[PDB]
Design an enzyme around this catalytic site. Structure first.
Site, mmCIF file in Angstrom:
data_model
loop_
_atom_site.group_PDB
_atom_site.id
_atom_site.type_symbol
_atom_site.label_atom_id
_atom_site.label_comp_id
_atom_site.label_asym_id
_atom_site.label_seq_id
_atom_site.Cartn_x
_atom_site.Cartn_y
_atom_site.Cartn_z
ATOM 1 N N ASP A 101 0.825 -1.046 0.004
ATOM 2 C CA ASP A 101 0.095 -0.113 -0.008
ATOM 3 C C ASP A 101 0.931 1.214 0.058
ATOM 4 O O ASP A 101 1.239 1.731 1.019
ATOM 5 C CB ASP A 101 -0.835 -0.107 1.306
ATOM 6 C CG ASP A 101 -1.970 0.981 1.205
ATOM 7 O OD1 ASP A 101 -1.988 1.932 0.201
ATOM 8 O OD2 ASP A 101 -2.890 0.986 1.919
ATOM 9 N N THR A 102 1.166 1.678 -1.116
ATOM 10 C CA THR A 102 1.964 2.863 -1.115
ATOM 11 C C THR A 102 1.255 4.341 -0.695
ATOM 12 O O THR A 102 1.989 5.199 -0.378
ATOM 13 C CB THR A 102 2.331 3.346 -2.811
ATOM 14 O OG1 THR A 102 1.285 3.314 -3.862
ATOM 15 C CG2 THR A 102 3.336 2.275 -3.051
ATOM 16 N N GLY A 103 -0.213 4.125 -0.412
ATOM 17 C CA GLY A 103 -0.691 5.141 -0.029
ATOM 18 C C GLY A 103 -0.931 5.297 1.533
ATOM 19 O O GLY A 103 -1.428 5.999 2.101
#
Ligand SMILES: COc1ccc(S(=O)(=O)N(CC(C)C)C[C@@H](O)[C@H](Cc2ccccc2)NC(=O)O[C@@H]2C[C@@H]3CO[C@@H]4O[C@H]2C[C@H]34)cc1
Ligand SMILES: [Cl-]
Ligand SMILES: [Cl-]
Ligand code: NA
Lengths: 99, 99
Positions: free
Chosen positions: A25-27
């Protein structure tokens, strides 16, 4: 690996000797896992997601394997709808976004 | 480009004639933008994540330019705390996660 995004980027992680599924999850600034037992002391943290602010337990310096890559860092435990591997651990496994 | 994950992977987008900053978010199935007007038909939707659900408006067939790359797809509009580019549009720009 090179992971495309047509499906959710789910991987297996290992934490406390147990396998779990988690989302890369880059967010997410931080890694958030569903209720489980971890060793040591925890500290309080408030995190803000799409639907508001929840309380989690912050455990530091936890051994965790992510898609076979060894990391040691902070895990937040609480009522997350999915296990999420955030940037604090994606950086430890050398992950980048590319286009 | 290659985007490291030491900091949030924010990019400039162009949507509805407006420039916004948005997070490249592999953990988001869908693209979710803060309140704005878009043309055409919409329908209501509920989306969930940390903290619970929010109600959004679902607009289909919206053209977005993401860090210079054009892509068309569904855009959800509502009370998100951050503008999110989700997988539905990350695929179209050829974004991959690499480690
Ligand atoms: C159907 O389409 C969608 C689109 C998006 C979302 S979602 O936004 O709920 N989400 C899904 C995850 C499965 C939780 C994307 C995630 O990447 C958020 C994006 C996001 C960032 C900031 C605020 C709201 C939403 N990150 C975040 O929850 O990170 C934590 C929440 C906070 C932020 O940084 C830390 O990372 C962990 C713990 C802290 C849900 C449905
Ligand atoms: Cl779409
Ligand atoms: Cl592809
Ligand atoms: Na439309």
């Amino acid at each position: 690996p090179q992971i495309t995004l047509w499906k959710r980027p789910l991987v297996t992680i290992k934490i406390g000797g147990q396998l779990k599924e988690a989302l890369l999850d880059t967010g997410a600034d931080d890694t958030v896992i569903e209720e489980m037992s971890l060793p040591g002391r925890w500290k309080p943290k408030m995190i803000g997601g799409i639907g508001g602010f929840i309380k989690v337990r912050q455990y530091d310096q936890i051994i965790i394997e992510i898609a076979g890559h060894k990391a040691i860092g902070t895990v937040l435990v609480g009522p997350t709808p999915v296990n999420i591997i955030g940037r604090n651990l994606l950086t430890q496994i050398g992950a980048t976004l590319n286009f």
